[PDB]
């Protein structure tokens, strides 16, 4: 199954907190934003982050998310 | 034991019967008569002389013939 790891989610929270205005609900733009404000050592990882970060946004923007 | 040579008597059986069957093939001949199977195959070339039977699919493996016309 598809469970995102700590290093992933750990990054998403970290990104979101200090970049909420800069980020959107769209995967591809966010994906790009990662190349600027973060230095990720591989593409799959970077997308995976960009993907979960975009996931939280799409529910953050529907009510405050626990952490 | 079957029959691998025409008996004339056996021959009469054929054309005075095969148009009974609305389905005839290699086997169809064998069990209703006691044809060889080898000769069954020649009897079927033969039985498409002046179409005593009519074809719908002729194949190496399987032959499908129907009643007269």
């Amino acid at each position: 199954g598809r469970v995102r790891t700590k290093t992933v989610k750990r990054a998403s929270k970290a990104l979101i907190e200090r970049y909420y205005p800069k980020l959107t609900l769209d995967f591809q733009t966010n994906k790009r934003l990662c190349d600027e404000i973060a230095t990720i050592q591989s593409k799959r990882l970077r997308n995976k982050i960009a993907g979960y970060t975009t996931h939280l946004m799409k529910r953050i923007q529907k009510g405050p998310v626990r952490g | 034991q079957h029959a691998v040579i025409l008996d004339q008597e056996k021959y009469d059986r054929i054309l005075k019967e095969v148009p009974t069957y609305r389905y005839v093939s290699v086997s169809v001949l064998v069990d209703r008569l006691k044809i060889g199977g080898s000769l069954a195959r020649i009897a079927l070339r033969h039985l498409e002389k002046e179409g005593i039977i009519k074809p719908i699919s002729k194949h190496s493996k399987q032959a499908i013939y129907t009643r007269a016309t």
């Binding site: - | 691998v4 040579i5 025409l6 008996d7 004339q8 021959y11 020649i42 009897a43 033969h46 002389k49």
Partner: protein, 145 residues
């Protein structure tokens, strides 16, 4: 269309080379009942005897019979090549042969007796009853006899 009849002419079961030969089975294969005629030999003899292979040995004129029997015991004389044969270059006579009938078992016996008389390795096993070509005997050919 091989749809023809034949009256009393057809005669099932005839006799060749001291063998009894089925008539309602194909010539090429009817003849292969004899100790010494396999498919490839029976296919060729027949060719050289002007015989219509599209036939059963229950046909075949008693004329067509001798014409076949003749070629079978003098094959090398009817444009049959020596390699096609089951005993070329004898060990006592040097002539190219092709044995048949009860006569094959005979020269099978002679051959064995031969190199048994001589008490060579190969001959011994035959007598004992072991396998004579270099196979293992440890784990195979069991139940014997």
């Amino acid at each position: 269309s091989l749809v023809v009849q034949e009256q009393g002419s057809f005669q099932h079961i005839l006799r060749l080379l001291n063998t009894n030969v089925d008539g309602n089975i194909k010539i090429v294969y009817a003849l292969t009942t004899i100790k010494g005629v396999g498919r490839r030999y029976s296919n060729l003899v027949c060719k050289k005897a002007d015989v219509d292979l599209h036939k059963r040995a229950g046909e075949l004129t008693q004329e067509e019979l001798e014409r076949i029997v003749q070629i079978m015991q003098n094959p090398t004389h009817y444009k049959i090549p020596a390699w096609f044969l089951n005993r070329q270059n004898d060990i006592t006579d040097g002539k190219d042969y092709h044995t048949l009938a009860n006569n094959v078992e005979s020269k099978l016996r002679d051959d064995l007796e031969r190199l048994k008389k001589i008490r060579a390795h190969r001959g011994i096993r035959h007598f004992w009853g072991l396998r004579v070509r270099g196979q293992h005997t440890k784990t195979t050919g069991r139940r014997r006899a």
